[PDB]
Amino acid sequence: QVAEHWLLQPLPEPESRYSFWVTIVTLLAFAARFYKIWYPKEVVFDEVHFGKFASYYLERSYFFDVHPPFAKMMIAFIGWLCGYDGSFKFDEIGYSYETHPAPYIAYRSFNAILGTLTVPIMFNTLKELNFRAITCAFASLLVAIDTAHVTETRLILLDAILIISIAATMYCYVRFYKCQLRQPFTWSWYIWLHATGLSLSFVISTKYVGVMTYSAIGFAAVVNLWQLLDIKAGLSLRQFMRHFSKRLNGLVLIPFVIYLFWFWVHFTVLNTSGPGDAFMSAEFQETLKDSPLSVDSKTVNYFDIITIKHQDTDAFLHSHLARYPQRYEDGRISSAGQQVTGYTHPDFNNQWEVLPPHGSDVGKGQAVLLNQHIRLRHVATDTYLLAHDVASPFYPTNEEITTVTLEEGDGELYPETLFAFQPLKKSDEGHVLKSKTVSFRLFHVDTSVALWTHNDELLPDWGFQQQEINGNKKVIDPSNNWVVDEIVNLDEVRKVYIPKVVKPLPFLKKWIETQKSMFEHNNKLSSEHPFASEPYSWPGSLSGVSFWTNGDEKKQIYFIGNIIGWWFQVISLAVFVGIIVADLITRHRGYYALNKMTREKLYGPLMFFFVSWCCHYFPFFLMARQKFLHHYLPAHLIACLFSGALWEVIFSDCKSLDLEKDEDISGASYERNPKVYVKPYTVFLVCVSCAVAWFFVYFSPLVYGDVSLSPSEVVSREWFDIELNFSK
């Protein structure tokens, strides 16, 4: 069998040396991932997607995504362990975790644990392939201190769960293969077969790129089944069929059941209507409960008395008979008009009647539509809401919000009383306004400002320590968002809620529909992200991706590989192809340069990793969808194992005993324990490790985002197609 004599050898070193080196490289990996894990205190890159999906799992709100559910459910499960409710939505990059406390440190720590645990799995994979402890240490170090693997595995991303599942798959398959070489159908053989299947299931249940890991293990499993089919293997056809049926069960059938199990959990957790509904059929949507918000949601009509609540501060739009001071503390002149403030408690001064524009044919009981002109009458003071070209108390650029008498507001000031419930999305213009479910900006028509409030500073004693309400000129700002909370004057007929009768759908029908939608949307979504990259640029790490930027501090996170480490792997792949071509040419000439044991290393573990790298790299040249550098991290992970292994072989006594005799011929004498030139090999590995570590330290400001770089220091890190922020 492939590399049978090599893989059945005892370990080349005592276990204490392996335990020493695995501990050191795991501690380095831990230090690199947990360094400043609380920073930045803001949403970074795709945390906007995976944090948001974690929130929807906790709320039980149905969402659609192009990837399978397992890794998102693992993130959500950490939130659930922290008692997080899903309130924070991760809507944009740069959103502060201080205003709405998501357990972001716990999520980042979970990924940092998985990224750290990848390193000892990689180490133990080479240990089980009978490589030296220093070789295992070096290959694992190339992942422990790679800038791309570090950046991805400390943020709230799926790739930490993907990469550990790929590492576990490679390790479990190597363990299975050693059990297969020693004694097939042992209890240990079954454990490792099903552990390979389980790990393969987690790979494909995280991202569909996991098919490349199935292809790599599938190829190796087929090659070994081909050797067991040979008459020279001494197996009966019944014994071969026993191998085939058990591997089919352990590597295909059981992993497929575990893959379906994650969709069954996903549909059982997500039992409420949500943002995913638009991607599914009406029959699927009938399986979802109404949202708690939709149950209480009532259409807002003209002449309804409403309370309007701010989304970020929970404050109600409020007014009372007190007036703005004739001058603010900075000496600016106010209108001396009636105060409009943000009040956090429900009272009679939160009540606004929604009135149509003057001269409209719109009667009582007609629904208010989004982006229609309206007037708001304060019920307690009998005044119209007004905004004008007077500056607000705290913000000189924002407008003071006040109220005017009915006579003046029906006279010359009529334009200044016109508001609209402006939708957050232009697609939602002309939809019916509903309480609790429809967010809007309260937009002033004449001056083109949105009503806004804040809770970092409260009005002085003359404003009763209430929140300021002002006209923000940055209309698109997400902090300008309001909702109608209650309709106070709701008719008894409009109070009656009719619950939707949930209709059951068979699980396989539900799964087939979602799966078709997943593949159809993954194939579409054509776009031009200022960071898409083609497969030919990945092994060189020629371009990267901006993950986060802070303009005030001139700080940034940039996703890029350790270029010294990546180029060392490209050289390693090229050298190996050269060695294989040279071995094939020399053998075809009757010249047997390489010892049998060197060939078992080359055509066994090194060829297994080389083909596994090919499976994770070349299929991307056949993909016409958008691609990104992170898609190469599975291939880079395998290239780290490969490069460590290759250089041990190069620094071994590779010579055949007799250059005219093929040592592969049965009964030929060959050297069973080729000497590794440990001294020059260790010096070589230390030199490469020091260069990779130097690069990691030099790029560490861009991995962590924690240090501001001068423009000259930014430009010194710009090479090839690396564009960095703050180079000017």
């Binding site: 997607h49 990059i93 579409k524 960095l724 703050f726």
Partner: peptide
């Protein structure tokens, strides 16, 4: 408004 250096730190799309 100073023009941006790298287009902008943005996310990957998830369809409609």
């Amino acid at each position: 408004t100073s023009t941006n250096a790298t287009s902008s730190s943005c996310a990957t799309p998830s369809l409609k």
